[PDB]
Amino acid sequence: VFPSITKPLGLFKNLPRQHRAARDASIWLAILTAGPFGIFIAFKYYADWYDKKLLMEYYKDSIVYGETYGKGKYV
Amino acid sequence: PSSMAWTIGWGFYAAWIMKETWNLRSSSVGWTPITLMEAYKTKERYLRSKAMMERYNSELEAVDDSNITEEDAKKFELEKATPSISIWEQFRSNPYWKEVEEEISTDVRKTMLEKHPDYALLLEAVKKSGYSKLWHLPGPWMNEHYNDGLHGRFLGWTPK
């Protein structure tokens, strides 16, 4: 389906209809490109956050890593 | 982009070419004193090393295998296995080999100034203001035909 995003947003209204449709198609392609990118980036950053939490809770009272992993400074 | 942009780009490229050419020639000229000083230093080090090794070999030859006294066993420290020591350190720890190291250093320094008279000049530059103050040192090295007496050696792993 892929409606014409630029009509309800009033974008590119000084171009013929065919060129406006080309721009809408490009915008829709851009939207579909960034989906999986977003999913994977979110998962990676969640993984890093969880790693920091685990290190801070395991090496909380350690003697060697009680100030880097314990504080999460350089996880 | 307009043609004016491309003319500007060509101008920048020409400026880059000019800067590269000037830097290339300046660097080629400026490293002559430093390379010469390096060559003289390695020449002196090689001569001193050979002299000390020959002295050590001669001293060892004089020791009789029939009987080794304490002095010899103390001179060469024959208690620490040879592969367990640094021979060159023995010229920086044992007093006797320390004295001979100093004497050989003086002898080699005396000899070098003969075959490399200009060495003293570099000595003035390095002593006064450190190795860094030779980047554009003027002297008798600014001559493509000037002979430094190295015979093309002590500059690289192969003859120059």
């Binding site: - | 070419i17 050419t21 290339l24 020639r25 430093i34 390379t35 000083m37 390096e38 190795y131």
Partner: protein, 53 residues
């Protein structure tokens, strides 16, 4: 990289810039050749446009 020689500073005066330079590359002669090819390119472009117009 693994190198036959030493390329760590403060052991010799010309060792830090050893691995980082391949000095035998015929520098200013290569510069002259580049100038020649630039001459050729610009002359040919100018003449091509001149004949086309």
């Amino acid at each position: 990289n693994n190198l036959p020689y030493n390329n760590n500073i403060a052991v010799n005066l010309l060792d830090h810039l050893n691995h980082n330079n391949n000095t035998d590359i015929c520098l200013y002669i290569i510069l002259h050749n580049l100038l020649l090819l630039l001459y050729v390119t610009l002359i040919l472009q100018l003449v091509h446009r001149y004949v086309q117009l």
